[PDB]
Amino acid sequence: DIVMTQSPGTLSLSPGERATLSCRTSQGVSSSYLAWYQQKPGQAPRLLISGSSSRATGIPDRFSGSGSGRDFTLTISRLEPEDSAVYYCQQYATSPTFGQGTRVEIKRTVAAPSVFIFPPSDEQLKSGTASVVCLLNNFYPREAKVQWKVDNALQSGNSQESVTEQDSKDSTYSLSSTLTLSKADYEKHKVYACEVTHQGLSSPVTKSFNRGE
Amino acid sequence: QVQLVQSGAEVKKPGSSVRVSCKASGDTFSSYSITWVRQAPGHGLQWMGGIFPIFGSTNYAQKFDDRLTITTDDSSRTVYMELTSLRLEDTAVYYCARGASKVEPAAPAYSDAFDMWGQGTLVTVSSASTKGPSVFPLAPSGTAALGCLVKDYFPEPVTVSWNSGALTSGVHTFPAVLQSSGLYSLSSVVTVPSSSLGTQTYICNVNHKPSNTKVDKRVE
């Protein structure tokens, strides 16, 4: 078997800059037997290039393939925003093998999030659980910090977050931190805040609420 | 749109066996080869096997030579994968895909580039049993934010839309997290301007397939 090795792991470049991706094989493969794929979040992969350098139909000129032997390359000659994605090489000379992908991350100037805190719905409280949600909307970069506090008591170990993939239009991230409590605890306390710390913020932002309206 | 359409995702107890369907266009079914590539965290895109319906010939990867078997149904041009004695590691998205070459007189290159792909079938190999979510309003207080908390289901996945498709701009359907409880929890939001909460009413359209759950929940 042949082992596709892609490098680097992530590529962070601005639109209009050139991307070049490396895919190395564990042994020599002819140019005819190589494919490149593109996977954007939550989709199948699209064939971009087959036989080292033949563009599949409908694929833009800014993708080209090259190399031979044990070193093959895809160059996105000038990145679009919409080229934020992961990308896989495949040998099909023998038994098909794929690399583990390169992620391209589209650079952008700093964007502070806009923050939104949601208290628990009554229909869930009538069910015995209490889920408070806090949204960080359209920020860049990906490095952000969400610290729940309940009546200035800092939370830990009770909150989970998940992050939407880099938008293909405005290249930002959005996150969703969720403090979870029992219906019991949720009534023993009154000042439910969510404090955000991101590069775009002069100092940490706090949204909050009270159990009122 | 010369497409490939697949069966729904499933949860399967270990040691069991799942089968995933792959239904084609007729053109594809006559003159091309259909492959099964699976993708899971930690070892990525993994070739499994491929079938040439016009010949009925198969070639699987060594990794699966006994647990895997690929079969067609010419009556409706559906290809079938069946992976047997499921292991934990099998859990993945299984894709079907058209090989790039059209069939040749002398033949068959099972090793091939993959032209066209289906939409994905997520096989959870889990001892846990199905559970439908409980959706809950995410209610607002000049742009506002609202959503729906699709809390407490299994397996993956659920889908989320807004106004049965009519609302899409500003919609953030987050990736599911897996709780300490062992069930999944998800969150969709959408931003709209405050002026429209007098005008427009907003419903999310939650759909969790393997439990056969569908919910439409309006938001304040």
Numbering used by the authors:
A (entry chain L): 1 to 27, 27A, 28 to 212
B (entry chain H): 1 to 52, 52A, 53 to 82, 82A, 82B, 82C, 83 to 100, 100A, ...
Paper text:
The trimeric HA protein is critical for facilitating virus entry and infection of host cells and is the major target of neutralizing antibodies.
To further investigate the antibody epitope, we determined the crystal structure of H3v-47 Fab in complex with H3N2 A/Minnesota/11/2010 (Minn2010/H3v) HA, at 3.57 Å resolution. Initial phases were obtained by molecular replacement using high-resolution structures that we also determined for H3v-47 Fab at 2.57 Å resolution and Minn2010/H3v HA-LSTc at 2.90 Å resolution (instead of the apo HA form at 3.15 Å, see below). While the F(ab′)2 form of H3v-47 neutralized at a similar potency to the IgG, H3v-47 Fab displayed a greater than 190-fold reduction in the IC50 value in comparison to IgG (<1 pM). Thus, H3v-47 requires the bivalency of IgG to potently neutralize the virus.
